[PDB]
Write a protein that binds this ligand. Structure first.
Ligand code: Y01
Ligand code: Y01
Ligand code: Y01
Ligand code: Y01
Ligand code: Y01
Ligand code: Y01
Ligand code: Y01
Ligand code: NAG
Ligand code: NAG
Ligand code: NCT
Ligand code: NCT
Lengths: 237, 186, 132, 49, 96, 44
């Protein structure tokens, strides 16, 4: 039985036929569909690697009655099916022994570790390149002239698009609070900057329309905002 | 280790009903604590990020003609977050999540902001030739102006000044009530 | 440019294309062996439409700038007042400079339009010929 | 007691009627109040110049 | 059994009845619901052709005892039901 | 609200029409300059 099952059958459930030899040997190869639970580490999404473990072992027997021996140190892949999305980097078998609270004897087990990788072309051609594209517009709004009067529209569109991308990708990755995905942090960072951009641009837009007969205050402002322009390498009138 | 969820303690107690004299059972209780970092960085940050625009809207000058766009956009974003946070919470009408209550209050606030914004926008574009109404407004607003610590000073400009004064007033009282609304979260 | 809604149209187009692209990635398998042709076409159109939105915010800034701030009439009057006869377009104090500024904005917009429409027509048909 | 086309005899049955109610707080805080609130903008457009 | 299953029944589960003839001949015809896995190639979407494979065979018997022989080179379609979404261009069998 | 949008596009077209396209003042000045006291609104 495998100790790492989640919503599935523990032991083999098909019970197909087996092979005997004249010396007493017996060989049995049942097929099965196993459902394990491995900690999907999503940090370098999508350039990701997954280290998933399965743990087979006896249940009602000890090393003093049954002993396991791995025939092949590696998993055979002569009949493997290329999933198109995932490729197996390696599959290692390890023979271990433990001791539980129930009992006194030690119990053997075999741990298979699959280290696999994701082919990145799909998510880099359909998910991250559009958001990385539309994030390259948050700096664009300031260059747009003030009097035209559509800057707030661009800012709102960018912010809502970033929010949509963020709430979309929150589904595709696990809600594990042990680590944060990199793309999520980047998008939230861009949201912080775009929100900041919209408040500073509404500030400057209010500075634009204000009339001389209401908000004159010409003493302190002219001395400073008419001599920085040379420092900023821009021509005067 | 489970990852997102953390266990605290596992009490286990034998329940016995002395009145039925037949009922026995063992009840285990699991007290599980959610690690907050994920939902904090994915659900609370956008909310607190977009909720400031609700009061930010007024500082936009009326002559630009864009208050409607920003205000409706804020309202729509709040409705989206409200529906999402309602779809993620179990549909139990026994209690209300705190984030939902905060969203509903700030939505009422912004839908009051939209109507006061259309009011100021209407009182701005009046022409000095049609809606004079001088005596009842001149003295009252020239007296009100110092009560806001605002700078001092052809009637179209006067209506513009009036609109600026009143929406500055609303911005003051709006931020003053939003501070108390944020305090009410604690 | 004087109407003031071109960025609205650009954003509408770009967000709608993004929605359609995100939508189709539900229905086609998440396989990295090959990429759907429709997906490639849509990403191509998104690239060119964001290039369009940056060039159009640029021309929008070129348009509104004032004669009292960004005069620079030496280099510009030589080139952007002689591209028009080549591009097959008929020709015509501060108001004069403002008219010239609006005109140079319109001319750069037209000359960008020619290249963009040629590139779009080439990229749509010049890519859709596997079967024939 | 009823009687079906199959047979001549009558057949007994027990009908249980559950009359229940829905706690409204969830829906009345998430669905009806947002639309009732945004309905306060259908007339507001006319006052805008 | 089929080797290309994906979360489905490996063998038929209804276990219907079968016909015997006096000479010793036996015929069996169970229905089944299979879930195979296809190498879906989506390039000419939607004008697409799908090439799906199913792989039947014995499990614990070698060719030294059981030898499979295909009856028809093509798959019968007398009881086909027009789905409305897919039309079968052709179905070919191969012994290997 | 769709009735509102059609009536508001109507009134918005009414607002921007120029004196050199849609003059027609004879019948309008009698009906839409005496209705103002009826609606409790002040004139110029
Ligand atoms: C894919 C995205 C990042 C394209 C966005 C282009 C702009 C972010 C860059 C391209 C050339 C830059 C400009 C290059 C020249 C200068 C002059 C300088 O003075 C002020 C910034 C400015 C206009 C830069 C502003 C921003 C610009 C338009
Ligand atoms: C804390 C992080 C997100 C930085 C946010 C920047 C603002 C705190 C600063 C940047 C420029 C500031 C402004 C600079 C000019 C003034 C004019 C003054 O009148 C009122 C404050 C204000 C708008 C400042 C408000 C706050 C602003 C936006
Ligand atoms: C992180 C969020 C809450 C930033 C919110 C930005 C504005 C809502 C605040 C920041 C500084 C404030 C201002 C601070 C100075 C005053 C002067 C006062 O006269 C009128 C309000 C005003 C402009 C405030 C208006 C609103 C402002 C811009
Ligand atoms: C029922 C809810 C939406 C209350 C909305 C508040 C308005 C009905 C009140 C609050 C302050 C009022 C204003 C106070 C000042 C005047 C100036 C006067 O000239 C015209 C009406 C006006 C704008 C009032 C219009 C209506 C206003 C916006
Ligand atoms: C690189 C290929 C895929 C497309 C090239 C188009 C733009 C990257 C280039 C073409 C003309 C450039 C512009 C030429 C003039 C300047 C003025 C300068 O101020 C800011 C950058 C800008 C707009 C350039 C921005 C980018 C532009 C649009
Ligand atoms: C449940 C629904 C019908 C509520 C609709 C709200 C309106 C009946 C109220 C909200 C604010 C009011 C306004 C508040 C300001 C005034 C200025 C006054 O001059 C004329 C009425 C008016 C526009 C009021 C008109 C009607 C308004 C839009
Ligand atoms: C169901 C009740 C509210 C009547 C619906 C209002 C409009 C559908 C009707 C009423 C009078 C009509 C108008 C009557 C006069 C003409 C002039 C004509 O030029 C253009 C259409 C117009 C404005 C009609 C447009 C539509 C109007 C506003
Ligand atoms: C995968 O995890 C196992 C068990 O934690 C560990 O022993 C092994 O080092 C990991 N594989 C790699 C390549 O690090
Ligand atoms: C489908 O795949 C099979 C197996 O490789 C191949 O033999 C056959 O040619 C393919 N069908 C077509 C039309 O290419
Ligand atoms: C080896 N099993 C794994 C966990 C419990 C242990 C065990 C011990 C004795 C009888 N059955 C099971
Ligand atoms: C020959 N069968 C086909 C694939 C597995 C193999 C096999 C091996 C051992 C017992 N039964 C079947």
């Amino acid at each position: 039985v495998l100790y790492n099952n989640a919503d599935g059958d523990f032991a083999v459930t098909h019970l197909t036929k087996a092979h005997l030899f004249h010396d007493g040997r017996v060989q049995w190869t049942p097929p099965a569909i196993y459902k394990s639970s491995c900690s999907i580490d999503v940090t370098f999404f999508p350039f990701d690697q997954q280290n998933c473990t399965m743990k087979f072992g006896s249940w009602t027997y000890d090393k003093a009655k049954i002993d396991l021996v791995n025939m092949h140190s590696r998993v055979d892949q002569l009949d493997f099916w290329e999933s198109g999305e995932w490729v197996i980097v390696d599959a290692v078998g390890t023979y271990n022994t433990r001791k539980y609270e129930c009992c006194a004897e030690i119990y053997p087990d075999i741990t298979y570790a699959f280290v696999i990788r994701r082919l990145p072309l799909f998510y880099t051609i359909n998910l991250i390149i559009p958001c990385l594209l539309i994030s390259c517009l948050t700096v664009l709004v300031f260059y747009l002239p003030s009097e035209c009067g559509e800057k707030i529209t661009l800012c709102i569109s960018v912010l809502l698009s970033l929010t949509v991308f963020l709430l979309l990708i929150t589904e595709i990755i696990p809600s594990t609070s042990l680590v944060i995905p990199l793309i999520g942090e980047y998008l939230l960072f861009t949201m912080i900057f775009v929100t900041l951009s919209i408040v500073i641009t509404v500030f400057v837009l209010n500075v634009h329309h204000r009339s001389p007969r209401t908000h004159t205050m010409p003493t302190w402002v002219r001395r400073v905002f008419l001599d920085i322009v040379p420092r900023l390498l821009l021509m005067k009138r | 280790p489970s990852g997102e969820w953390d266990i605290v303690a596992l009490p286990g107690r034998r329940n016995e009903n002395p009145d039925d004299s037949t009922y026995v059972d063992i009840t285990y209780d699991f007290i599980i604590r959610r690690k907050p970092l994920f939902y904090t960085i994915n659900l609370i940050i956008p909310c607190v990020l977009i909720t400031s625009l609700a009061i930010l809207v007024f500082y936009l000058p009326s002559d630009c003609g864009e208050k409607m766009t920003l205000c409706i956009s804020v309202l729509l974003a709040l409705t989206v977050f409200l529906l999402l946070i309602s779809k993620i919470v179990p549909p139990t009408s026994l209690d209300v999540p705190l984030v939902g209550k905060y969203l509903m209050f700030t939505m009422v606030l912004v839908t009051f902001s939209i109507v006061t914004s259309v009011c100021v926008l209407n009182v701005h574009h009046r022409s000095p030739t049609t809606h004079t109404m001088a005596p009842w407004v001149k003295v009252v607003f020239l007296e009100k102006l110092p009560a806001l610590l605002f700078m001092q000073q052809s009637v179209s400009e006067d209506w513009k000044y009036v609109a600026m004064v009143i929406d500055r007033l609303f911005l003051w009282i709006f931020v003053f009530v939003c501070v108390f609304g944020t305090i009410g979260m604690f | 440019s004087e109407c003031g809604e071109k960025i609205t149209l650009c954003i509408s187009v770009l967000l709608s294309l993004t929605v359609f692209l995100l939508l189709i990635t539900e229905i086609i398998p998440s396989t990295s062996l090959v990429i759907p042709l429709i997906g490639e076409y849509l990403l191509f159109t998104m690239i060119f439409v964001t290039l369009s939105i940056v060039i159009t915010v640029f021309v929008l800034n070129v348009h509104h700038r004032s004669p009292r701030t960004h005069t620079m009439p030496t280099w510009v009057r030589r080139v952007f007042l002689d591209i028009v006869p080549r591009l097959l377009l008929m020709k015509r104090f501060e108001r004069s400079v403002k008219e010239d500024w609006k005109y140079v904005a319109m001319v750069i917009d037209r000359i960008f339009l020619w290249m963009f429409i040629i590139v779009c027509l080439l990229g749509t048909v010049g890519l859709f010929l596997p079967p024939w």
